[PDB]
Amino acid sequence: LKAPVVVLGAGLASVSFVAELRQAGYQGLITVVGDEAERPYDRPPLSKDFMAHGDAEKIRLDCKRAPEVEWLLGVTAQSFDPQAHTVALSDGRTLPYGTLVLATGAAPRALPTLQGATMPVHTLRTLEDARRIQAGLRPQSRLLIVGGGVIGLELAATARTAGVHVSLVCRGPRLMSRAAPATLADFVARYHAAQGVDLRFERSVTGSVDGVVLLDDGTRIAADMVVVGIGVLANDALARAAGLACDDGIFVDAYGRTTCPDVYALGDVTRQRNPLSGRFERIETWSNAQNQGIAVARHLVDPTAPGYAELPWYWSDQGALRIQVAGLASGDEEIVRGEVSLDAPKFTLIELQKGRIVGATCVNNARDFAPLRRLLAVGAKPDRAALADPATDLRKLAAA
């Protein structure tokens, strides 16, 4: 940890990182460069309560645990020179650094077949994106979602609640193909279908003409707005140009180190080891952004601290479904705890591999999720009849 510290990006990973630097006792300069001209804010509300209620002053991040930080908002870092240890800014200034931290996140993938569309086509990543989409969620209008991911499904639920007709086109046979158990994905489709979403599986968009989207089965879907949500691409251009190892994401180890000395990376922009799979992956979650930011900062201030070691998890709020998913989507066994039903949905899934818990899901059961995450953390091998047995107190198991 060499002063001064410069962080590129002012999202959750950056804020979490700089707050932890201060909390851990680093007192040198910290400067954060953020391209959005917005008080730093959290993204999960954008497809949830913000999309529904519109108050950005409810979604700001707390920068108070990060005192003495200069935030350069509305400024783009255009390049860095890792030999000279400088960053070039879009406003004409240059920042020196002792330690540079790349926390530039990821951007929605564009859909090539809708390039040159002459109807509204949006993606949902930023506060600006959310305001734009919300401005078009007119009651009785028609929205088409492209993609099977959670964000689009959250938007679908929000739109249905607002009286918007919703169709959805998914290239795969199931929703939430990324990091979600099939049992959950199947149930989620049943839920959305019951709420009036017109779901089209194993279909791809081939183009659009005069307000109508074309599909690869030779059919058409008319819509007033398309929201594309087919995933994101790491914002790793500065790293690539500067000679760091990257491949849709900046490769980092558990200390957040890139292949360039004195340059670290955090959050959505990184490709990193998933300890459960033992494979490198680009993790796309709120918990990773916060936890990785904190762990990297902690180890920078105190090199005796362990590297980042938290296991993955996320949540999604889709209408009546409060979904929580931890670890791996599958193993060699799933245990279903409770009944899977559209009538007052409430259930828990546990994924095991040779008796060891490797993942869990809770739908409308936050109380189960925390002890399951602890059991997951230590690779617990509990009695499987009991795991299924409704009589079982999971918090007790975790404590033991």
Ligand X SMILES: Cc1cc2nc3c(=O)[nH]c(=O)nc-3n(C[C@H](O)[C@H](O)[C@H](O)COP(=O)(O)OP(=O)(O)OC[C@H]3O[C@@H](n4cnc5c(N)ncnc54)[C@H](O)[C@@H]3O)c2cc1C
Contacts of 11 (CB under 8 A, 6+ apart): 34, 40, 43, 103, 105, 267, 268, 289
Enumerate residues 54-93 that contact ligand X by CB under 6 A: 76-77
# chain residues binding ligand X, by CB under 6 A: 37
* Backbone gaps in the chain, preceding residues (C–N over 2.5 A): none
Choice between 37 and 400, CB closer to ligand X? 37
Choice between 283 and 363, CB closer to its own copies? 283
Decide: is 363 part of the binding site for ligand X (CB under 6 A): no
Choice between 38 and 334, CB closer to ligand X? 38
Task: Quote the least distance from Cβ 158 to its own copies, whole Å.
Answer: 36
Choice between 308 and 314, CB closer to ligand X? 314
Listed residue (192, 94, 199, 193) closest to 147, CA to CA: 199
How many Cα atoms within 13 Å fall on the side-chain side of residue 56? 11
Using CB under 6 A, which of 99, 104, 324, 365 touches ligand X? 104
Residue 195, token pair as written in the block: 């709420």
Residue whose pair of structure tokens reads 């709120």 in the numeric block: 286
Enumerate residues 21-40 that contact ligand X by CB under 6 A: 33-36
Decide: is 43 part of the binding site for ligand X (CB under 6 A): yes
Q: How far apart are CA 325 and CA 335, in angstroms?
A: 14
Listed residue (68, 93, 87, 84) closest to 7, CA to CA: 87
Task: Quote the least distance from Cβ 8 to ligand X, whole Å.
Answer: 5
Residue 144 vs residues 222, 255, 265, 316, 329: alpha-carbon distances, Å: 8, 41, 35, 20, 27
Decide: is 109 part of the binding site for its own copies (CB under 8 A): no
Using CB under 8 A, which of 307, 319, 338, 355 touches its own copies? 307
Upstream peptide bond of 4 is cis (omega within 30 degrees of 0): yes
Decide: is 188 part of the binding site for its own copies (CB under 8 A): no
Q: What is the DSSP letter of 45?
A: G
Choice between 167 and 291, CB closer to its own copies? 291
Residue whose pair of structure tokens reads 């564009």 in the numeric block: 110
Residue 264 vs residues 4, 30, 180, 244, 260: alpha-carbon distances, Å: 14, 14, 30, 10, 8
Q: How far apart are CA 359 and CA 375, in angstroms?
A: 10
Decide: is 264 part of the binding site for ligand X (CB under 6 A): no
47 binds, among its own copies, ligand X, none (CB under 5 to 8 A by kind): ligand X
Enumerate residues 260-279 that contact its own copies by CB under 8 A: 260-261, 272-273, 278-279
# chain residues binding its own copies, by CB under 8 A: 20
Segment interacting with its own copies, rule: CB under 8 A, options 93-101, 200-208, 257-265, 370-378: 257-265
Choice between 199 and 260, CB closer to its own copies? 260
Decide: is 234 part of the binding site for its own copies (CB under 8 A): no
315 binds, among ligand X, its own copies, none (CB under 5 to 8 A by kind): ligand X
Decide: is 243 part of the binding site for its own copies (CB under 8 A): yes
Q: How far apart are CA 400 and CA 398, in angstroms?
A: 6
Segment interacting with ligand X, rule: CB under 6 A, options 110-118, 255-263, 286-294, 332-340: 286-294
35 binds, among its own copies, ligand X, none (CB under 5 to 8 A by kind): ligand X
Q: How far apart are CA 242 and CA 46, in angstroms?
A: 33
Residue 242, token pair as written in the block: 């500067």
Decide: is 124 part of the binding site for ligand X (CB under 6 A): yes
Decide: is 268 part of the binding site for ligand X (CB under 6 A): yes
Contacts of 396 (CB under 8 A, 6+ apart): none
Strands 198-201 and 270-274, how do they pair?
unpaired
In angstroms, the first-to-last Cα distance of the chain is 39
Decide: is 259 part of the binding site for its own copies (CB under 8 A): yes
Using CB under 8 A, which of 280, 319, 322, 388 touches its own copies? 280
Task: Quote the least distance from Cβ 277 to its own copies, whole Å.
Answer: 10
Q: Partners of 279 in the beta sheet?
A: 274
Angle separating helix axes 150-161 and 182-194, nearest 10 degrees = 20
In the complex, the residues that contact its own copies under the rule CB under 8 A are 243-245, 247, 251-255, 257-261, 272-273, 278-280, 307
Which residues are near ligand X by CB under 6 A? 8-14, 33-36, 43-44, 46-47, 76-77, 103-106, 124-125, 151, 235, 238, 267-269, 284-287, 289, 314-316
